[PDB]
Amino acid sequence: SRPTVVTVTETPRNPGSYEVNVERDGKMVVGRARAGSDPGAAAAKAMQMAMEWGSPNYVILGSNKVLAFIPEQLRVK
Amino acid sequence: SRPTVVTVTETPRNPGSYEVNVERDGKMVVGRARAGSDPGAAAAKAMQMAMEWGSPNYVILGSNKVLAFIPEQLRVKM
Amino acid sequence: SRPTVVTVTETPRNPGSYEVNVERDGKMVVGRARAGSDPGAAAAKAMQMAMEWGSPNYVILGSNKVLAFIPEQLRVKM
Amino acid sequence: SRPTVVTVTETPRNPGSYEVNVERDGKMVVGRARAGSDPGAAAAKAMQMAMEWGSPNYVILGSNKVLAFIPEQLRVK
Amino acid sequence: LSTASVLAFERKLDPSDALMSAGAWAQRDASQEWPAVTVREKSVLQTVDVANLPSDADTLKVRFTLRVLGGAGTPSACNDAAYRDKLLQTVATYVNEQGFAELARRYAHNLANARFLWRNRVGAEAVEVRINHIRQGEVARTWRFDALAIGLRDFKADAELDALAELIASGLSGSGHVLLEVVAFARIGDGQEVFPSQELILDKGDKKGQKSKTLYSVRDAAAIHSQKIGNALRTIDTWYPDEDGLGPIAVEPYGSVTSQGKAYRQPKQKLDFYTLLDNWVLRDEAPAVEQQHYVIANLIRGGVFGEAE
Amino acid sequence: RGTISNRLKTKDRDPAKLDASIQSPNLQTVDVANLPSDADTLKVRFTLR
RNA sequence: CUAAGAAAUUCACGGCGGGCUUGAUGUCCGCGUCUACCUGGUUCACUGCCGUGUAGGC
């Protein structure tokens, strides 16, 4: 896997709270970090983790409530 | 990847304080600058960074306590 | 972005001093003008920059120490 | 903006002199009129511009060096 | 080889804000406690700021200080030592040909006739200028000039004018430390209108009810900006491509009177500061004896002269 | 309020001019610190360890 | 001119019961933001000869 992968998942043990993972060239540099408690802060944390560690290109994954804050031309690069 | 992206995020190492990041044209112009200790200072710093950087267009991202101070989608996107 | 946006941000290079930024319609008319050295002068400068430079709408943004001197959700929006 | 607003701001082109703005019912009635060269004359002119130009619901804004010469009950009507 | 990416020159002839006072004539030899005039508001449905002498005073007095610092050719910042060394050799060649004597004579002429009284010199009846040399907190030398006999157009000769030009030349060379105090008395009239410096405010709004014209003041005392004094005593340039009859204008790159709207020394012709400077330092071309005065006056003024490269 | 006195690094007749013309003034805002009109000495104080 | 030509899947329902994630920790060091400047063209007012209207003085 060449580009960086940022995945925002929701914690099923406590609904409403999110977590973020960053891939970064086949060895994870961020594991289960605390994102926000709402989709907006999860989107902000995902875009921050895509700005850093995503120097050539990146891909942002996540739910539809999370990715409704990012325009469709900013999720993949 | 055309407009300037402004993100406001809360620091988890002490709850209540925020930090702002600004990216324009694939180059990180501002990295982890202090916004404040309440959501209002975070919203003011985000709107200032959208006014100064990113002249044609911008997108402002942040928490829901922070985006409650900006008018709903009228001034968040351009 | 139709209403005139007025923001008041605190400088982190020395704490307790503020600055104000005004944007009327797609262009910045006031950039980093000295607000004051206390929250009261910053609130007064924000209301002065919203009195003039204003269409029938405006919006004021600031921290939760400056926005206490402005009357509660009455003179902040238009 | 129904209450009349009276703001007292220090002119940054020379430190120590003040100027008062008075707005009533959408349009401004006094724009950048001179006050004294000390906070006492500025607070007195703010009180005088609060008596005229709004009988109900005046707001007086200013610095903490200016709003220390008036009592706490005479700042918001 | 190449003009530097950064090049900055400090300001010589550094003035201060001119302070205004009022009094009665035949009292100029004791005028040290005269009351400062103040600006006032007046309604016309607009509000303006006006200034006026008191009804017992018929003479205006303007006072400021002046310094000359020396070392005109040395830049404050640079980017390559080669261009700086060539520039120092060029200005050293100029001062070894002829010292700062023509420029100093024109500066002393602009101090002699009180040209820093911009619009309150026109309706004057009699003007007197006093210039003091301050050495150790006291007065070392006094000059007293009549300003209506010393005209604005032509540059006449006088013994005391040559003495003041020698003082300014010694200050500009680098052999002394000159601090001047300039006081000017103008007999306008009993209670007439004086003209302080007008204000520019980049934060004043647009809606009606705002003040239309505000004036400059320093701690409730009507004053003049220092940059207006600098532009007043910088008008020494008369060697430009227009014919004789308009008069001398100020030393600016692409020398331009912006109030009229015209711009002399356009870059289409080869008579501006930048191309003559580039030919002087790069292609070893001195334009004339007259254009060297203009280039060195533009270096005394200072600025930010940087080509990108 | 000053004049525009800098190198016109664009073209002579530029379609999208990255600056302004010479016959117009430019208005700027700057900070300045001065001495008062009666004071002629400046004092600077610091500590060292 | 068709492996051609034709066609009712129709009904019902209990997935239930229980639970200790535990402990521990040194991010840390350095720094020159410099330079120059005309708000200006622009205060058609006060009061009177006079019943209007239209002469005049400064």
XYZ file of C-alpha atoms (C1' of nucleotides) in Angstrom:
726
model
C 0.000 0.000 0.000
C 1.572 3.260 -1.203
C -0.739 6.112 0.012
C -1.733 6.878 3.577
C -5.017 5.448 4.871
C -6.949 7.285 7.588
C -9.869 5.287 8.992
C -12.423 6.719 11.421
C -14.426 4.052 13.235
C -17.030 4.241 15.986
C -16.573 2.514 19.330
C -19.370 -0.069 19.786
C -18.804 -0.239 23.558
C -19.786 3.443 23.847
C -21.892 4.723 20.949
C -21.325 8.244 19.694
C -17.568 8.311 20.324
C -15.067 7.819 17.508
C -11.485 6.644 16.996
C -8.918 7.184 14.246
C -6.199 4.971 12.746
C -3.441 5.992 10.316
C -1.663 3.480 8.067
C 1.431 5.291 6.649
C 3.322 2.841 4.407
C 2.433 -0.582 5.761
C 3.110 0.002 9.470
C 0.565 1.841 11.610
C 1.824 5.086 13.135
C -1.387 5.839 15.088
C -3.426 3.192 16.861
C -6.944 3.792 18.239
C -6.375 7.439 19.109
C -9.234 9.379 20.670
C -11.144 11.347 18.056
C -14.133 13.445 19.060
C -17.503 12.567 20.547
C -19.400 13.766 17.449
C -18.937 13.505 13.647
C -17.577 17.048 13.281
C -14.578 16.570 15.559
C -13.955 13.161 13.987
C -13.853 14.859 10.573
C -11.480 17.525 11.919
C -9.180 14.893 13.450
C -9.240 12.870 10.215
C -8.299 15.903 8.124
C -5.507 16.765 10.577
C -4.123 13.224 10.369
C -4.390 13.434 6.573
C -2.563 16.791 6.422
C 0.392 15.342 8.292
C 1.650 11.859 7.276
C 0.016 12.138 3.849
C 2.781 13.872 1.941
C 2.348 12.440 -1.611
C -1.264 11.201 -1.410
C -3.892 9.887 1.012
C -7.342 8.241 1.296
C -9.871 9.082 4.043
C -12.437 6.455 5.053
C -15.272 6.685 7.534
C -19.010 6.876 8.029
C -21.512 9.011 6.128
C -22.132 11.337 9.069
C -18.372 11.883 9.312
C -17.676 12.359 5.597
C -20.619 14.766 5.189
C -18.373 17.530 6.561
C -15.632 17.036 3.947
C -16.371 17.834 0.276
C -16.016 14.972 -2.181
C -12.860 16.415 -3.782
C -10.944 16.497 -0.470
C -11.371 12.884 0.702
C -9.087 11.248 -1.877
C -5.836 12.698 -3.161
C -7.422 20.128 -2.980
C -8.052 23.653 -4.263
C -9.474 25.558 -1.220
C -7.667 26.204 2.036
C -8.525 23.707 4.772
C -8.805 24.913 8.376
C -9.139 22.276 11.111
C -9.728 22.892 14.826
C -9.064 19.986 17.191
C -9.168 19.550 20.963
C -5.998 18.439 22.719
C -6.622 15.129 24.545
C -3.690 15.598 26.944
C -5.688 18.282 28.763
C -9.419 18.666 28.057
C -10.807 22.063 27.097
C -8.027 23.523 24.921
C -7.896 23.643 21.127
C -5.331 23.876 18.314
C -5.723 24.956 14.671
C -4.113 23.682 11.445
C -4.197 25.464 8.068
C -3.281 23.922 4.697
C -3.249 25.795 1.371
C -2.396 24.251 -2.038
C -0.976 21.025 -0.619
C 1.461 22.890 1.641
C 0.870 23.043 5.397
C 0.961 26.771 6.095
C 0.107 26.589 9.833
C 0.772 23.541 11.990
C -0.695 23.094 15.500
C -1.048 26.725 16.559
C -2.792 27.545 19.831
C -6.420 28.610 19.439
C -7.601 28.895 23.039
C -9.251 27.345 26.076
C -12.907 27.733 25.028
C -14.871 27.097 21.812
C -15.356 30.820 21.130
C -11.637 31.560 20.812
C -11.333 28.510 18.566
C -14.105 29.812 16.293
C -12.558 33.303 16.170
C -9.115 31.899 15.306
C -10.628 29.640 12.629
C -12.499 32.518 10.976
C -9.361 34.690 11.123
C -7.326 31.955 9.426
C -10.041 31.595 6.781
C -10.032 35.358 6.164
C -6.261 35.776 5.867
C -5.181 32.539 4.200
C -7.209 31.077 1.366
C -8.366 34.092 -0.624
C -10.731 32.471 -3.230
C -12.279 29.559 -1.282
C -12.057 27.778 2.076
C -13.568 24.963 4.158
C -13.711 25.131 7.973
C -13.780 21.887 9.965
C -14.111 21.464 13.705
C -16.148 20.156 16.598
C -19.862 20.785 17.056
C -19.351 23.028 20.088
C -16.985 25.129 17.955
C -19.084 25.346 14.770
C -22.120 26.455 16.801
C -20.664 29.985 16.874
C -20.294 30.259 13.080
C -23.572 30.730 11.140
C -24.822 27.393 9.837
C -23.142 26.646 6.462
C -23.450 30.258 5.227
C -19.907 31.234 6.253
C -18.386 27.779 6.844
C -17.878 27.024 3.126
C -16.940 29.164 0.143
C -20.511 35.041 2.820
C -22.923 37.992 2.924
C -22.783 39.569 6.454
C -19.798 41.547 7.689
C -17.670 39.269 9.875
C -15.821 40.740 12.872
C -13.409 38.545 14.858
C -11.444 39.327 18.042
C -8.441 37.091 18.760
C -5.849 37.154 21.542
C -2.182 37.316 20.574
C -0.159 34.458 22.124
C 3.142 36.364 21.864
C 2.081 38.296 24.964
C -1.094 37.314 26.828
C -3.870 39.725 27.654
C -3.766 41.754 24.427
C -6.240 41.372 21.577
C -6.661 42.158 17.872
C -9.681 42.642 15.598
C -10.282 41.616 11.960
C -13.163 42.833 9.761
C -14.340 41.408 6.423
C -17.256 43.072 4.648
C -17.836 41.264 1.345
C -15.096 38.967 0.065
C -12.332 41.431 0.965
C -10.520 42.256 4.197
C -11.039 45.875 5.237
C -9.266 45.848 8.644
C -6.375 43.529 9.424
C -5.005 43.048 12.919
C -5.786 46.393 14.479
C -4.938 46.753 18.158
C -8.065 45.993 20.196
C -6.761 46.625 23.700
C -5.133 45.226 26.825
C -8.228 43.837 28.589
C -11.502 42.131 27.549
C -13.484 45.367 27.908
C -11.530 47.294 25.276
C -11.729 44.302 22.926
C -15.525 44.147 23.301
C -15.755 47.916 22.770
C -13.573 47.707 19.648
C -15.681 44.837 18.281
C -18.916 46.783 18.751
C -17.301 49.856 17.177
C -16.162 47.856 14.139
C -19.657 46.353 13.856
C -21.460 49.713 14.162
C -19.689 51.036 11.090
C -18.571 48.650 8.282
C -21.978 47.041 8.627
C -24.789 46.217 6.254
C -28.181 45.313 7.831
C -26.428 42.077 8.968
C -23.217 41.357 10.899
C -21.630 38.699 13.129
C -19.194 39.053 16.057
C -16.877 36.239 17.184
C -14.668 36.176 20.260
C -13.630 34.256 23.341
C -15.858 33.510 26.334
C -14.261 36.325 28.358
C -14.820 39.027 25.722
C -18.333 37.916 24.731
C -19.519 38.318 28.352
C -19.431 42.127 28.073
C -21.577 42.042 24.922
C -25.292 41.595 25.813
C -26.313 37.945 25.736
C -27.325 36.849 22.206
C -28.906 40.232 21.426
C -26.222 42.499 19.934
C -24.041 39.641 18.651
C -26.036 38.839 15.489
C -28.071 40.702 12.891
C -30.163 45.785 17.835
C -32.903 47.478 19.879
C -30.909 48.859 22.889
C -28.897 51.972 22.056
C -25.153 51.298 22.123
C -22.471 53.668 23.462
C -18.844 52.551 23.054
C -15.682 54.318 24.252
C -12.483 53.352 22.428
C -8.942 54.688 22.827
C -7.470 56.057 19.597
C -4.232 54.135 18.887
C -2.649 57.005 16.932
C -1.993 58.810 20.202
C -2.243 56.837 23.458
C -4.295 58.394 26.234
C -7.160 60.039 24.318
C -10.603 58.528 23.842
C -13.491 58.692 21.391
C -17.145 57.717 21.788
C -19.602 56.192 19.299
C -23.381 56.276 19.841
C -25.873 54.224 17.803
C -29.663 54.270 18.196
C -32.143 52.047 16.306
C -30.078 50.707 13.432
C -28.392 53.959 12.392
C -25.597 55.801 14.164
C -26.145 59.189 15.774
C -22.581 60.011 16.923
C -19.468 58.820 15.112
C -15.956 59.286 16.558
C -16.533 62.347 18.726
C -13.741 63.537 20.991
C -13.596 62.790 24.699
C -10.968 63.900 27.180
C -7.329 62.963 27.649
C -8.030 60.841 30.750
C -10.488 58.057 31.692
C -12.469 60.364 34.003
C -13.581 62.713 31.228
C -14.198 59.697 28.974
C -16.464 58.029 31.547
C -18.272 61.330 32.172
C -18.865 61.822 28.442
C -20.078 58.213 28.206
C -22.616 58.891 30.974
C -23.709 62.116 29.246
C -24.089 60.308 25.910
C -26.062 57.622 27.751
C -28.551 60.134 29.182
C -29.244 61.629 25.769
C -29.738 59.428 22.658
C -31.424 56.651 24.557
C -33.883 56.966 27.412
C -34.557 53.177 27.648
C -31.922 50.437 27.352
C -28.515 52.006 26.954
C -25.345 49.922 26.846
C -22.022 51.480 27.872
C -18.864 49.718 26.710
C -15.271 50.656 27.393
C -12.047 49.672 29.070
C -11.627 48.592 32.682
C -9.844 51.887 33.358
C -12.904 53.718 31.992
C -15.644 51.534 33.520
C -14.109 51.872 37.006
C -15.287 55.465 37.518
C -18.992 54.586 37.200
C -20.904 52.252 39.563
C -21.667 48.686 38.543
C -25.423 49.310 38.262
C -24.960 52.185 35.778
C -23.331 50.181 32.965
C -26.306 48.226 31.557
C -29.850 49.597 31.715
C 27.156 41.533 -11.452
C 23.565 41.485 -10.199
C 21.410 43.776 -8.091
C 20.809 42.328 -4.645
C 17.577 40.594 -3.672
C 17.410 42.695 -0.494
C 18.793 46.226 -0.200
C 17.647 48.728 2.409
C 18.887 52.192 3.357
C 18.324 53.992 6.647
C 16.845 57.473 6.864
C 19.130 60.453 7.158
C 17.495 63.848 7.825
C 15.223 62.405 10.512
C 12.655 65.006 11.690
C 10.056 64.999 14.472
C 6.406 66.028 14.658
C 6.097 69.800 14.400
C 4.234 71.368 17.323
C 2.114 74.499 16.886
C 1.553 77.405 19.272
C 0.075 80.896 19.102
C 0.983 84.307 20.412
C 1.475 87.991 19.731
C 4.207 89.508 17.579
C 7.151 91.395 19.128
C 7.285 88.588 21.705
C 9.256 85.948 19.761
C 12.356 86.497 21.911
C 10.476 85.240 25.000
C 8.113 82.702 23.390
C 8.640 79.531 25.425
C 5.312 79.253 27.308
C 2.887 80.052 24.492
C -0.361 78.042 24.624
C -0.779 75.236 22.121
C -3.722 75.550 19.746
C -6.336 72.792 19.815
C -8.593 71.302 17.168
C -12.350 71.670 17.578
C -15.496 70.175 16.078
C -18.002 72.170 14.061
C -21.302 71.237 12.440
C -21.982 72.388 8.892
C -25.507 67.705 8.533
C -21.804 66.852 8.780
C -19.153 67.373 11.451
C -15.708 68.719 10.549
C -12.571 69.455 12.546
C -11.246 73.007 12.312
C -8.391 74.909 13.925
C -8.090 78.609 14.693
C -5.789 81.015 16.481
C -7.095 82.631 19.682
C -8.614 86.093 19.411
C -5.655 87.653 21.269
C -2.964 85.929 19.167
C -1.949 86.906 15.634
C 1.300 84.931 15.177
C 1.798 81.187 14.693
C 4.926 79.391 15.920
C 5.945 75.945 14.654
C 8.752 74.027 16.355
C 10.584 70.773 15.610
C 14.033 69.153 15.789
C 16.330 67.673 13.153
C 19.253 65.243 12.963
C 21.766 64.346 10.256
C 23.468 60.986 10.611
C 26.110 60.523 7.909
C 27.295 57.424 6.077
C 24.936 57.740 3.130
C 26.226 54.959 0.890
C 26.358 52.098 3.392
C 23.194 49.963 3.166
C 21.452 48.532 6.201
C 20.852 45.090 4.663
C 22.230 43.259 1.641
C 22.495 39.806 0.091
C 25.856 39.711 -1.743
C 29.085 41.436 -0.747
C 30.063 42.161 -4.365
C 27.225 44.599 -5.070
C 27.751 46.278 -1.690
C 31.487 46.715 -2.350
C 30.817 48.135 -5.826
C 28.201 50.494 -4.345
C 30.607 51.675 -1.638
C 33.318 52.271 -4.252
C 30.845 54.223 -6.410
C 29.602 56.491 -3.599
C 33.207 56.925 -2.393
C 34.139 57.999 -5.930
C 31.262 60.506 -5.868
C 32.208 62.034 -2.515
C 35.876 62.167 -3.563
C 34.861 64.117 -6.679
C 32.652 66.569 -4.770
C 31.496 66.533 -1.163
C 27.925 66.989 -0.006
C 27.857 70.744 -0.698
C 25.177 71.262 -3.361
C 22.630 69.069 -1.556
C 23.457 70.714 1.777
C 23.033 74.168 0.241
C 19.615 73.234 -1.142
C 18.623 71.736 2.237
C 19.687 74.928 4.020
C 17.724 76.894 1.416
C 14.612 74.787 2.109
C 15.141 75.462 5.820
C 15.672 79.192 5.208
C 12.379 79.903 3.463
C 9.847 78.215 5.745
C 8.505 75.769 3.164
C 7.426 73.332 5.900
C 4.591 75.790 6.562
C 2.606 74.257 3.715
C -0.617 76.249 3.308
C -0.182 78.770 6.140
C 2.721 80.411 4.263
C 0.556 81.684 1.387
C -1.468 84.287 3.271
C 1.461 85.307 5.448
C 2.550 88.901 6.017
C 6.002 88.327 7.552
C 7.857 85.099 8.350
C 10.964 84.670 10.514
C 12.907 81.412 10.936
C 15.282 80.668 13.825
C 17.694 77.726 13.794
C 19.751 76.607 16.801
C 22.687 74.189 16.953
C 22.418 72.098 20.135
C 25.816 70.794 21.272
C 25.563 69.820 24.961
C 22.008 70.788 25.842
C 22.752 74.480 25.215
C 22.937 76.727 22.144
C 26.204 76.706 20.200
C 25.176 78.788 17.154
C 22.050 80.728 16.147
C 20.808 81.563 12.642
C 17.988 84.028 11.947
C 16.502 84.142 8.451
C 13.861 86.189 6.677
C 11.733 83.784 4.664
C 9.835 86.168 2.390
C 13.018 87.726 0.994
C 14.492 84.267 0.311
C 12.228 83.065 -2.486
C 11.106 79.570 -3.400
C 12.070 79.402 -7.076
C 15.744 80.367 -7.354
C 18.660 79.425 -5.101
C 20.372 82.678 -4.099
C 23.538 83.150 -2.025
C 24.156 84.459 1.491
C 26.986 84.202 4.013
C 24.911 82.687 6.826
C 23.278 80.353 4.302
C 26.766 79.128 3.409
C 27.540 78.712 7.125
C 24.429 76.574 7.655
C 25.317 74.606 4.515
C 28.791 73.989 5.971
C 27.173 72.714 9.181
C 24.834 70.357 7.298
C 27.738 69.243 5.068
C 29.909 68.419 8.090
C 26.976 66.490 9.533
C 26.345 64.572 6.308
C 30.033 63.746 5.783
C 30.601 62.034 9.128
C 32.928 64.394 10.983
C 30.481 65.800 13.539
C 27.179 65.340 15.350
C 24.596 67.958 14.369
C 21.317 68.437 16.237
C 19.193 71.355 15.043
C 16.163 73.047 16.567
C 13.952 74.830 14.022
C 11.341 77.417 15.048
C 9.268 79.394 12.537
C 7.049 82.409 13.253
C 4.418 83.367 10.673
C 2.198 86.454 10.955
C -1.063 85.075 9.588
C -3.580 87.379 11.245
C -5.713 88.010 14.301
C -7.654 84.796 14.801
C -7.282 83.382 11.280
C -7.384 79.724 10.221
C -4.289 77.572 10.581
C -3.902 74.306 8.678
C -2.692 71.295 10.688
C -1.933 67.974 9.032
C -5.022 66.135 7.856
C -5.656 62.594 9.019
C -5.799 59.320 7.120
C -7.625 56.502 8.917
C -7.845 53.097 7.242
C -10.530 51.845 9.665
C -13.177 54.559 9.241
C -16.495 53.150 8.071
C -18.791 54.123 5.236
C -22.267 54.784 6.658
C -23.526 58.334 7.044
C -23.178 60.207 10.303
C -19.414 59.694 10.388
C -16.919 62.537 10.693
C -15.959 63.935 7.307
C -12.564 65.455 8.162
C -10.410 64.991 11.264
C -7.083 66.667 12.007
C -3.853 65.536 13.635
C -3.119 66.224 17.296
C -0.523 65.181 19.892
C -1.925 65.144 23.475
C -4.553 67.842 22.750
C -2.255 70.062 20.677
C -2.547 70.607 16.925
C 0.528 69.268 15.142
C 1.949 68.357 11.724
C 3.129 64.901 10.633
C 6.876 64.352 10.397
C 6.640 62.847 6.906
C 5.064 66.072 5.642
C 8.061 67.982 7.034
C 10.350 65.501 5.279
C 8.540 65.905 1.959
C 8.629 69.674 2.491
C 12.402 69.871 2.923
C 13.063 67.163 0.317
C 11.917 69.350 -2.626
C 15.353 69.997 -4.118
C 14.962 68.187 -7.459
C 14.777 70.416 -10.534
C 16.798 68.469 -13.141
C 14.001 66.558 -14.861
C 12.731 66.397 -18.445
C 9.971 69.007 -18.148
C 10.590 72.628 -19.114
C 11.441 75.414 -16.682
C 8.510 77.187 -15.063
C 6.741 74.605 -12.921
C 9.388 74.651 -10.183
C 11.338 72.045 -8.223
C 9.639 68.878 -7.002
C 10.493 66.236 -4.403
C 13.102 63.498 -4.790
C 11.218 60.244 -5.433
C 11.916 57.279 -7.728
C 9.884 58.000 -10.861
C 9.452 61.522 -9.466
C 5.721 62.054 -9.356
C 3.384 64.725 -8.034
C 0.449 62.468 -7.200
C -1.874 65.297 -6.102
C -1.892 66.723 -9.630
C -1.929 63.252 -11.197
C 1.151 63.500 -13.432
C 4.308 61.412 -13.090
C 7.598 62.823 -14.332
C 10.599 60.537 -14.982
C 8.639 57.710 -16.553
C 10.623 54.470 -17.077
C 10.019 54.664 -20.851
C 12.552 57.490 -20.854
C 15.934 56.849 -19.256
C 15.687 59.452 -16.501
C 14.452 57.620 -13.390
C 16.404 56.566 -10.306
C 16.570 52.836 -10.997
C 18.067 52.767 -14.504
C 20.581 55.554 -13.808
C 21.635 53.709 -10.649
C 21.950 50.411 -12.546
C 24.058 52.044 -15.267
C 26.221 53.710 -12.615
C 26.968 50.579 -10.598
C 26.903 47.920 -13.340
C 27.824 49.394 -16.738
C 30.186 52.085 -15.310
C 28.131 54.908 -16.811
C 27.844 58.194 -14.963
C 24.778 59.940 -16.445
C 25.806 63.565 -15.808
C 27.004 65.778 -12.994
C 23.365 66.729 -12.390
C 21.975 63.191 -12.184
C 24.526 62.220 -9.528
C 22.873 64.803 -7.255
C 19.518 63.103 -7.853
C 20.822 59.573 -7.221
C 22.658 60.543 -4.023
C 19.612 62.500 -2.808
C 17.515 59.389 -3.424
C 20.023 57.373 -1.376
C 19.893 59.939 1.460
C 16.099 59.554 1.442
C 16.278 55.749 1.585
C 13.958 52.958 0.576
C 13.574 49.288 -0.279
C 15.388 48.693 -3.593
C 15.292 44.992 -4.380
C 15.189 43.135 -7.687
C 13.830 39.590 -7.500
C 16.345 37.440 -9.467
C -0.181 58.146 2.252
C 2.843 57.631 0.047
C 3.826 57.011 -3.558
C 4.578 53.708 -5.286
C 8.381 53.642 -5.543
C 9.562 50.082 -6.173
C 10.744 47.981 -9.089
C 7.894 47.234 -11.499
C 8.843 43.581 -11.950
C 5.776 42.928 -14.131
C 5.414 43.915 -17.792
C 4.984 47.482 -19.029
C 1.444 46.735 -20.263
C 0.427 43.850 -18.017
C -2.992 42.225 -18.563
C -3.211 40.900 -14.986
C -1.199 43.589 -13.206
C 0.350 42.302 -9.968
C 0.827 45.901 -8.743
C -0.616 49.385 -9.334
C 0.265 52.449 -11.405
C 2.615 55.325 -10.617
C 0.123 58.217 -10.884
C -1.900 56.878 -7.906
C -0.969 56.936 -4.201
C -0.804 54.014 -1.809
C -2.106 54.102 1.756
C -0.439 51.990 4.453
C -0.559 51.309 8.195
C 2.578 51.052 10.347
C 3.665 51.014 13.980
C 5.969 53.688 15.387
C 7.519 54.478 18.773
C 8.749 57.964 19.683
C 10.037 59.921 22.619
C 7.795 62.532 24.274
C 8.364 66.143 23.288
C 10.038 67.062 26.600
C 12.075 63.874 27.123
C 15.410 63.466 25.335
C 16.886 60.364 27.025
C 16.012 56.693 26.539
C 16.555 54.127 29.307
C 16.879 50.393 28.594
C 16.904 47.887 31.465
C 17.483 44.125 31.669
C 19.005 41.440 33.919
C 21.688 38.802 33.380
C 22.513 35.505 35.090
C -41.060 -18.160 -38.847
C -36.833 -18.331 -32.506
C -35.632 -26.935 -28.010
C -41.567 -22.717 -31.385
C -46.792 -22.251 -29.188
C -49.595 -22.568 -22.576
C -49.286 -22.083 -17.001
C -51.318 -19.078 -9.295
C -46.640 -22.729 -4.376
C -50.159 -21.979 -0.581
C -50.168 -21.653 4.478
C -47.997 -21.199 10.891
C -44.208 -20.199 14.753
C -41.048 -17.515 22.382
C -33.623 -18.552 21.601
C -33.055 -18.445 26.380
C -29.749 -17.905 31.123
C -24.491 -16.096 34.242
C -19.888 -13.176 34.699
C -13.619 -8.382 38.544
C -8.873 -6.879 32.801
C -4.935 -6.156 35.901
C -0.762 -3.484 37.420
C 4.787 0.552 35.998
C 7.185 4.846 33.786
C 12.262 11.810 33.220
C 11.272 14.236 26.009
C 15.312 17.366 25.820
C 18.318 20.877 24.063
C 19.717 26.544 20.256
C 18.226 31.198 17.849
C 18.936 39.327 14.931
C 12.773 40.094 10.942
C 14.676 44.054 8.579
C 13.669 48.981 5.257
C 10.976 53.951 2.771
C 6.270 57.271 2.636
C 1.917 64.756 1.479
C -5.515 62.430 2.842
C -6.500 65.725 -0.692
C -9.349 67.574 -4.189
C -14.212 69.739 -0.938
C -17.250 74.475 5.346
C -22.628 77.315 -1.521
C -23.676 80.175 5.141
C -26.033 84.303 8.202
C -29.540 87.605 8.161
C -32.267 91.410 5.771
C -35.520 94.910 1.632
C -39.493 92.188 1.102
C -46.797 90.228 2.227
C -44.840 86.331 -2.247
C -40.531 86.962 -5.931
C -35.665 88.791 -6.565
C -32.645 92.640 -5.910
C -27.599 93.221 -2.258
C -23.053 92.810 1.775
C -18.909 90.178 3.634
